[PDB]
Amino acid sequence: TTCCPSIVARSNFNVCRLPGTSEAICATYTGCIIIPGATCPGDYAN
C-alpha cells in the first residue's frame, strides 16, 4: 500500500506511475511511502 504525506505528493506520485515507474522509485521521488499493511498513519494521510 502507498501512503502519501500531502495531496501534492500523491498527485506527483500518480504522474510518476503513469510510465510504469516502480512504486519504490516514485516513493523516494515524492516522499510517499510503501507499507506492507493497508492502514496509512496519520502523518501519511493522503
From Swiss-Prot:
GO cellular component terms given for this protein: extracellular region
Compartment list: Secreted
Keywords: Disulfide bond, Plant defense, Secreted
Keyword check for Mitochondrion: no
One Pfam family this sequence matches: Thionin
Coiled coil (residue ranges): none
Superkingdom assignment: Eukaryota
Disulfide bonds: 3-40, 4-32, 16-26
Stretches that traverse the bilayer: none
Biological processes per GO annotation: defense response
InterPro entries named in the record: Thionin (IPR001010), Thionin-like_sf (IPR036391)
Chief place where the protein resides: secreted
Record family assignment: Belongs to the plant thionin (TC 1.C.44) family.
Note in the entry: Two isoforms exists, a major form PL (shown here) and a minor form SI.
Function (record text): The function of this hydrophobic plant seed protein is not known.
Designated name of the protein: Crambin
Organism, scientific name: Crambe hispanica subsp. abyssinica (Abyssinian kale)
